[PDB]
């Protein structure tokens, strides 16, 4: 059976690219949902994440509508036209105005976006929630990181930037010290910074500090103040034992870094996306107004996400005061509500005009997001563009959104069975939202206070410990996986999919039968189906090499580890598609880890 | 088969306290080898140095000669007033100009060696050898391991409380600040450890190195000058090293939160003095002449050494016995290895060459005075508590008045009676201990598989480390070149190693990547002694002559045998989850010696032996 | 517990060097036994036997250099020194022994074991009998014209293009012609004797080299032969030619094949313990394979013309009278001794019958047997490194000669050993013609690697089947009787010694060969490929799984069932 509806079969087509049915779905899985991507798709002149492909599409729809009474709008269209693409002299331009070191510092990251040193911009505190607050916190860095000669290429290219500089004349060694005073640097910063699993305990990391020695303004070069916050003691000291001959060598490095930042300075994308970037809610103006299509959106998610919610909260007084968090959360779908025109223009109105163009929009996004600190402290907002695609809870507004912008590509569709929405954009939203009970998020509270939304804390911390173990024990095939930094999302989506996997069961039961085999892989019930998107989601394959640099730095785990991780832990699965115990996919043995 | 002889039949009768024939062979082979000694006991070393220490009870039990053994009948032999004072030295808890927090720490130190806001050591330089220098470095944590991080598995905050309850009994009758200052000590200390270095960065010693002089860190910070005078004209001026130049750089409600801590600390390792009551919290003559095993080190050492053997036999024996392991380690060589280069071989080999013994004495310890020299100053006054604090006093205080003479390069770094060797590559050195002179690690008239797994083992067990990723860096005299490129191959290889261990767990894990280390040795050492064996046995082909206590076993597998044997080591569980877990070591690096998995006659594709990537081939 | 015997020790390094503990020793049998072997050697084909004949011929070359004072040897050195650089077709055989049109050799008659009666039988070709012709491969069928014009312009004109296309269309005509080996599986057919007058220059033709009854094993292409009937010369002049494209081997290789007495007198005298080591062996397997109608075979056995070693005509006179048909003297002469071997052969015709015979040089390895006179024949060379050396574990020696004669041995019981008596003549054994499907079934049930069939060669199929596992019976006896020679080999102590028995047997066999050569190889001889002969005969010889007791399911113990038998 099929409603053969087209579609439906629209929706079939992007199901079978990646279909793979040579092997048996009860063996192995994430073969059996992607290994065709993998293959057909030769790896595109990285990483081609199901996401990226999106990204390719939306970014383009918004180049076809761009083209074309209209203010901001306008103002991209410009902005992007100017991209078909020297200017060097310009950028020295910059240094020259340039050459109290702090202050100048201070300007250089302000109208440059570039961060060195004191990575930082504001947000509602933590601990007094209406009272905006500064931050200042160890910067972040290139490699991310011992062992490595990596290191070594790290040097290679900054002499190699710093010599194609040496082109403009407006010496032909000494470039070959500098390089290795800021490499050094670099592992100066870095030796003292905090390495990541460590950056949980938001009880620490709050001490507050108003109006430590070798100071200097530096906040003029940004731009009583409240008590700015600093997030490392330890490194926001570490500056203060690191200071006239300094200037030479701490601003050798400022520009090399600087420099650094934009060499290269359809492709259209590039720019295109650089833009969404930087400011953000004008290409997402565009990208909503120019699709408008609300309906299918308003609704489908903020009938959807309810249901998950609901239903997994669901599934002793913690239950209660978590239950009262969620039902708090402020929960942003689509785009917000600053969009007629004009007041999209207001807060957007900085910019107009006939690497300038660039210039122009590195400044006025890092004073964009922080230009509420004037203005009174809400809960209210987006991290970033309404155009990208991810979803993300920043807890310390208690704050769910979900970009408009994946909505379209399979996460979600308007006309596609309750399955693949249910697993697309049901499980990203399902995701986030436990996203904000695992140790990161269990830390706040239905404001944004702490005292702890959590004793129970230790069936929290019999999970993790066990599903840590799982991985460590259950390593991808390009050699392993670290631990808590990678619990750090996956406790997440190892919850998230079981909260919408129990909505798609409850919803259906709320809607009589309907499982229409879908007209293209006709023989599945829907369940099947709905593993094999969320599966497919996350089709991607990557360079080989790429693979393991992007295994250690990435928060969340490889693709494949993931999706025939998750599944493995879950008993309904398990059933569906109608195996047999003591196989490949089968934690009677090495338990599943139950995670709720 | 075998002789009848009384030595062997000893040797053959250790060998049945252990073993199993029932369990399969390759099926886990640390049971293979120790089922029994577990089965029993309630482990290895621990018998050894009990064995040891009886030894010099026995001993003693009649000058160093009379400081042990005063100490000695101290230790077993004996309230708050008098260290109160010391308390009362700074102010306490409950209830002030800006005081050089180290001033108070620098006289700590020196008084009871008691390291906090700094570890200092104190020797031979890394990087222009011909001096003594100081190495102040972050402290080394109470709570074992930084795990101020990923569980909050801290109860500390009350076995701090309870054990901080002194005052209400010492001198006062007020909770809430107890608690909120004990819980207080713990956020400092947390404040700390998220700035140390966590060992894994502990390795390139290279940039550890960094030599100030109290101009420089005047011009870097805050005091430095003021402390040195707690440690005889100083040398302030000679190169001194922050290893780690992270100091985070630090008011009421936050100074004396240290003071608070200090002190915490002392007492909380003085209690002993304390009234019978707080002791509490914490054999008889084990743990005393163990407390004096680090404190007067060469006291009891002269004293077994002197006393209970002839130095000439067993010394001259194990020169030659070490000669061989060395020799043929040696022979794994560039010619043997695989990610070395024809220099850095003939380098390293040098390494090697050039490299030092040590047996049992120091050079010195045998006109009978001079050691009475070395251990001289130790004031003797039967005429407890302020004996121990003495003797500590002395033990750093001998540490250091070592500073300002001229470096050597035999420095014997602790007391020769523990069972245990150690290699210093700050300086270059290969010491032994007559303490390991001994059973099962050793013994005279006993096969020679054994002598080779005991005393053998632990020879190379260590002396590998001047060849580990920690050995390259410090040359053949000591000094920093890198002495080899080779390294890319040399760490590639090691993560075999690190996945080996990572996916093998013992108790229901023990994450590899962070011991890597020592883990190498584990083969390192085993893999020479064994090559050795082969080689002596083969220049005889005789030895073999099965064991009387049991025909069945052969004169190779015994080898790997006893080896497995030494770490027998019933380490109950609370013990176990509080080097490497043992189990482990046995089973893994056995895995990786091929060799093994043959001579041990049992089928290959079994958990005992993995196929073509055979053997991370290290070594 | 193992032995030091430094003999048992380089008999140990060779079996060692080829075994590999990499793979397990259940799965894939054949593999683990010798992987290594095939990863260790360079590059036609090339195997242990390959090897071993090596070996031997290098050694006779050595000795050849050294004594250079029989005039035989002196022929043979002389030899090796200088090679280190209708009526028509009868005549060429003649001069020549390169065959065309038809194949033609003399034996003891089949009817009665007295006159040595005529075979003419249907002619082998350069490449296989029946690979020209199915709806198929297209091979090299230029290399004919490639390989004439080559020598043909150094003879010096186009001719040459027709005269190919014609030429190897006069092949194409004659393959079909031929039978396939198929059917050359029953001797109450070839037999069919005809005269001198039948012929109907056949006369004429044998006067190229007989009153007797002459016999023609094949009447369907010798009628064939008739209607086929100038430009032919052509083609033979092509074979002919076609004969004729470190050399140490190549060399004493061909020596071999022509001087095949001389080799193996200059090779076997520079001995009385060694025959008597075998000896034994060889009556110990008969014996043991007797002991399991009846009478018949019985005696067949107990007359069996046994002959160790070499010739016992093999002091000089005989050696120098039997070969003394040669005059050689200073390449001609390849053809020299072309024609001195192939006339030797065929004046034995004259005389009457023997039962002592040599079919071929006693130089290299394969203990060929006739059931034409009745013989089994071990030529001294095979007896030797690892087959069996004078003092290996009796593991080997019965693992090596041992097998060799007992795969030999069978013959006289398999698809032809029937149908031959102990004399040389014919005449419920159905029961055992249902094995033969059996195994030809079971057997094709399984393939080789690379086409993936054998239903050809169940006849050396079943030889090794049961030669093998009877001799292992014998083994077992033979230490039966002791109890103790069971001191395992030193530098492999984890195998016992039936273990070891069988790890030699397969190593016996291993090889690593070229693609292209497998293919031709599977169609092409009586032989299974090797990996499936290893893998197969074991996976039916019970006390083998025994030994190893790899338990049911792994993929060499299919025992439900069962391992058909002789």
């Known amino acids: 059976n099929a409603n053969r509806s087209k579609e439906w079969k629209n929706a079939a087509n992007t199901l079978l690219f990646g279909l793979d049915e040579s092997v048996d779905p009860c063996e192995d899985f994430y073969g059996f949902t992607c290994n065709k991507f993998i293959e057909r798709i030769d790896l595109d002149e990285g990483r081609f994440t199901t996401f990226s ?3 390719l599409e939306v970014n383009s729809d918004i180049v076809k509508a761009l083209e074309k009474f209209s203010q901001t709008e306008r103002i991209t269209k410009a902005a992007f036209q100017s991209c078909v693409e020297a200017s060097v002299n310009e ?35 933590h601990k ?106 330890a490194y926001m000291g570490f500056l203060n034992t690191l ?15 600087m420099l650094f930042e934009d060499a ?9 996306d650089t833009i969404t970037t930087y400011m953000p809610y004008g290409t997402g103006y565009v990208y909503v107004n120019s699709r408008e299509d609300r309906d299918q959106v308003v609704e489908d998610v903020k009938q959807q996400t309810e249901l998950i919610m609901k239903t997994f909260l669901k599934k002793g007084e913690s239950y209660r005061r978590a239950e009262k968090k969620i039902n708090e959360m402020h929960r942003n779908y689509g785009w917000p509500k600053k969009l007629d025109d004009y007041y999209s223009i207001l807060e957007a109105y900085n910019n107009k005009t006939d690497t300038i163009l660039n210039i122009l929009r590195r400044g006025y996004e890092n004073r964009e997001s922080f230009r509420r600190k004037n203005e009174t402290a809400d809960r209210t907002n987006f991290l970033e563009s309404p155009a990208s695609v991810n979803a993300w809870y920043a807890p310390e507004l208690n704050s769910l959104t979900l970009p408009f912008g994946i909505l379209t590509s399979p996460h979600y569709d308007l006309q596609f ?95 009589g039968a309907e499982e229409m085999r879908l007209p293209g892989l006709e023989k599945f019930t829907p369940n099947q189906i709905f593993w094999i998107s969320y599966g497919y989601s996350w089709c ?39 195996c ?17």
């Open 53 to 55: 492909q999106a990204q």
């Open 91 to 125: 950028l020295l331009q910059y240094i020259s105005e340039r050459f109290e070191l702090y202050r100048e510092m201070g300007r250089i990251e302000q109208q440059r976006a570039l961060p060195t040193f004191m990575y930082t911009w504001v947000n509602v505190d």
């Open 128 to 233: 007094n929630v209406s009272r905006n607050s500064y931050y200042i916190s160890q910067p972040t860095l290139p490699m991310p990181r011992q062992f490595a000669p990596e290191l070594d290429a790290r040097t290679k290219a900054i002499e190699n930037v710093m010599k194609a500089f040496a082109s403009d004349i407006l010496y032909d060694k000494m470039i070959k010290t500098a390089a290795r005073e800021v490499t050094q640097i670099e592992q100066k910063i870095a030796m003292a910074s905090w390495p990541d699993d460590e950056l949980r305990n938001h009880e620490q990391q709050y001490n507050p500090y108003e109006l430590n020695i070798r100071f200097g303004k530096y906040i003029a070069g940004l731009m009583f103040i409240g008590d700015v916050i600093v997030t490392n003691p």
């Open 243 to 257: 200071f006239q001959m300094n200037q030479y060598p701490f601003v050798n490095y400022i520009i090399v870094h």
């Open 264 to 272: 290269e300075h359809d492709a259209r994308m590039k720019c295109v």
């Open 417 to 511: 069975p309750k399955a693949f929405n249910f697993a697309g954009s049901g499980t990203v939203g399902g995701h986030e939202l436990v996203h904000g009970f695992d140790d990161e998020g269990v830390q706040f509270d239905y404001d944004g206070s702490l005292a702890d939304c959590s004793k129970g804390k230790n069936g929290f911390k019999d999970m993790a410990q066990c599903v840590v173990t799982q991985y460590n024990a259950q390593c991808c095939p390009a050699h392993c996986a670290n631990g808590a930094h990678t619990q750090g999302e996956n406790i997440a989506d190892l919850g998230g999919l079981q909260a919408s996997y129990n909505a798609y069961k409850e919803y259906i039961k709320m809607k």
């Open 540 to 578: 991607a394959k990557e360079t080989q090499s790429s693979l393991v640099k992007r295994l250690l730095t990435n928060p969340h785990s490889p693709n494949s580890c993931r999706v025939n991780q998750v599944l493995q832990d879950i008993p309904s699965f398990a059933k569906d598609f109608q």
């Open 580 to 596: 047999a115990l003591g196989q490949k996919m089968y934690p009677p043995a090495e338990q599943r880890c139950k995670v709720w």
